[PDB]
Amino acid sequence: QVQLQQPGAELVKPGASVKLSCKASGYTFTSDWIHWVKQRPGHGLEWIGEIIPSYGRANYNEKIQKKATLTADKSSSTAFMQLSSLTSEDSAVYYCARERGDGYFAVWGAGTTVTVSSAKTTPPSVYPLAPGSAAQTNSMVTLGCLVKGYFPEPVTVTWNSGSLSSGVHTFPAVLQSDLYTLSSSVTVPSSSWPSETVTCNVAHPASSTKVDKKIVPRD
Amino acid sequence: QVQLQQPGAELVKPGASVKLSCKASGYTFTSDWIHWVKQRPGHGLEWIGEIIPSYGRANYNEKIQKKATLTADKSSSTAFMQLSSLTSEDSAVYYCARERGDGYFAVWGAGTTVTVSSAKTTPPSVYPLAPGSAAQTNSMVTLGCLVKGYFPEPVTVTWNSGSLSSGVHTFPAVLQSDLYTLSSSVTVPSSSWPSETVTCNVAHPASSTKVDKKIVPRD
Amino acid sequence: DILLTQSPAILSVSPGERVSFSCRASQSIGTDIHWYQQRTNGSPRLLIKYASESISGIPSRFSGSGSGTDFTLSINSVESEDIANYYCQQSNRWPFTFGSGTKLEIKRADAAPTVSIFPPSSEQLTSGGASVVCFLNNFYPKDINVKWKIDGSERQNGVLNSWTDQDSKDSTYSMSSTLTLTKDEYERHNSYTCEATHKTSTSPIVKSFNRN
C-alpha cells in the first residue's frame, strides 16, 4: 505494498478544523506531487489542490471556497491537509493521490471519511443472524450479522478476516435519530456450516473498535 | 499493369484467423506506405492500419477492436494482414492501397471478400438461358445465364471472356439455406445470334473454379 | 479551467456486448486525457492514460481513443466486474479537472430473490430491543416490494429498507428489510412474516417464523 496510507474516518464539529494525513511509501522522488480529491456522498470527484513536498509549494482549486492548507513533512514522508471552519457542505471522502509530474493519478489512498456533525462517536453493536429453527435449507445457506447504533460512518465488515470473498453483500447504512445501522449477508454451501466456523469481523475506524462475532445455530 | 494484387475471396470459421496478402509492382520506393481499408456490405470505407515495408513499422486504427497484424516481406514485395479471432462483424471486403507518404491512396487492390461463416465452399452450377421457341425477337435479343448454389461470395461473370461490354447486367446474389444465386443478362443485335457465338464465363475465387457455358437456341 | 462533459450519465449494455463512454473537452487538449474506474466504495483506479496507452493490471478488454476534444473509453465484452463509475481527467492545462462521470449497468436475465428471515438475537433482546431482518438477495430487475405481517396483519411502523447497487459478481440487486420494535412489542405477537413481490413470480415469495 500500500503506497498511500489515510485514516478511515474523522468526526468534526461545525466551525471546527481537522488535519487529514497521507503517509507515502514505495519510490518517493523530488519530482512527485501529492493531490487531494473530495467526493461528497453520491457525487463525483473534485480536485481540491496539490503540494510538491521537496519544495513544499502548494496550489489550490480557486473555483470553490478555500477550506484546505497543504503541508508536507519530508522526514516522515507525510502530506497533511488542514481543513478549517467546516460546515456540512464539507462532509465527504477525501483521497490523496500521487502524480509523478506527467499528469495522471497512478496510485490513490483509501480516503478518509470526514463527517461534520454535532453528534457523538458511538461504536456499533453486532448481533448474529442464524436462521430460525423452522427453515428448510438447500445446497446453500444464508447467514448474516447486524451492525447497529454507530456514528459516524463508516464501518468495515469482513467474513473470516477476509478469507470469505464469494457470497457476501453488505447493505448501505440507514440514519435514525443521529445513529446508523446496516446488515451484511454471507452464503456458504449448507454442508460447510456449522461444521466449519463463520465469523463476521466489524471495524469502526472513528471509535478504534474492531469486534468479531461468531454465527452459531440458535440455542 | 495492375500495381496491387489481392486474392478474390477467403472463407473463415467463427473464432478462426486468416492472413490476407497484397503483392505490389511498378515503382516500390523505401518512402512507400501500404494501407488496409475495410468495407462491410453496403457500408463506407474504414481505415484499418498502415505498414512501411522498408522499416516494417506498423500503425493501427485504435477507434475499433484490434483484429489486424501487419507484416511485410521486402524480398517478395508483399504486404500481409493477419486478421485473428473473427466473428461475423468481420465479414467484409478488405482493400490494400499504396500511399507515397503525401497522404492520398493513388492505387488500390481489387480487394479480398472475407466471409466468416460455418458453412462450406460450394462451386456454382451454371445454366444457359436462351429464349423459348415461341418468342418474337426484334432488332436486339436478350440471352442470360444462371449461377446458382455457390458459397461463399463472390462470383465473376464475363461475356465472351471480356469482349462483350455493352448490353450486360449481373443481378445481386440472394441467400437460400446457406447458398447464393444470381443471374446475368446480355443483349446483342438479333442478326449477330446465333450466327456469332455467345459464352458466359463464371469464375468463383473461393473454390478456384472457372466454368464457360455456351448459349445455343433450345433443342 | 477545462470542462469535461461525460454524456450519457448511465449506460445500459447486455453481457458480452461492446460499450463506449464519451468524454468531450471544452477546448482541444491533444491526448492529455486519462480514465479512472471507481467500484461501489472503492478508490479510483487508473485504466488508461494519454487517451490510448494501457496500464498493466488492466484487462486487454479496456481500450481508449481520441484526440482534440473527443475521447472514448471502450470495453469489448462487458462483464459483471466492469459495473462501476468511469471518470475522465485532463492534464493539458492547469488545473487538472475531472468529468462528471458515467455509471455502467448490465441488463442480465431476470432472477427471483432468495428470501431469508432472521429472528432477533438473544444478545439483542438482553439490551431491550428486537430487530427482525429479512434479506431479498440476488434478483433482477431491481424493482421489488417487501410487505411485513405480524400475526397475519400487515405492519408499516419500524420497517427501514436498504438496496445494494448492482453487484459486480453477478449483475443482480439485493435488499435488506428490517422491522424494529421494543422487546415488549415483540414479546406480545407470535408470527412474523416477510413477503416479496417480484416480476419473476405472480405469487409473493413469503418467509415466516413464529416466536413460539
Added chain:
Amino acid sequence: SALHWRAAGAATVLLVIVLLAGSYLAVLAERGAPGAQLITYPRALWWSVVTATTVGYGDLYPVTLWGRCVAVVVMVAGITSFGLVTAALATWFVGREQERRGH
C-alpha cells in the same frame, strides 16, 4: 586539452544541467496559473530544448513571471553555449591557417 575545447565541453555539460533545472523550475513556476500548458516534466524538457536552441515553436511557453524569468536564463545559457562552440571552432581554424601559412 586547450582552453577553447575545455570551455566548449564545460558549456555543453552546463547547458544539460540548465535544461534539467529549467524543466523542473518552470513546472513549479507554472502550475497554479490557469491555462498554463508548461505543467508536466517531460514536455517542459522539450520546451527547455526548443527555447535554448531558439527554435521557439510556441506549442509551449510559460505565462507566469517566474516561468518567464526561468525561460530567460534558458535562452541565455543556450545562446552562450552555442556561441562558445562557434568561438572554439574559430580558434581551431585560425591556428590551423597560421600553421599552414608556415607561421
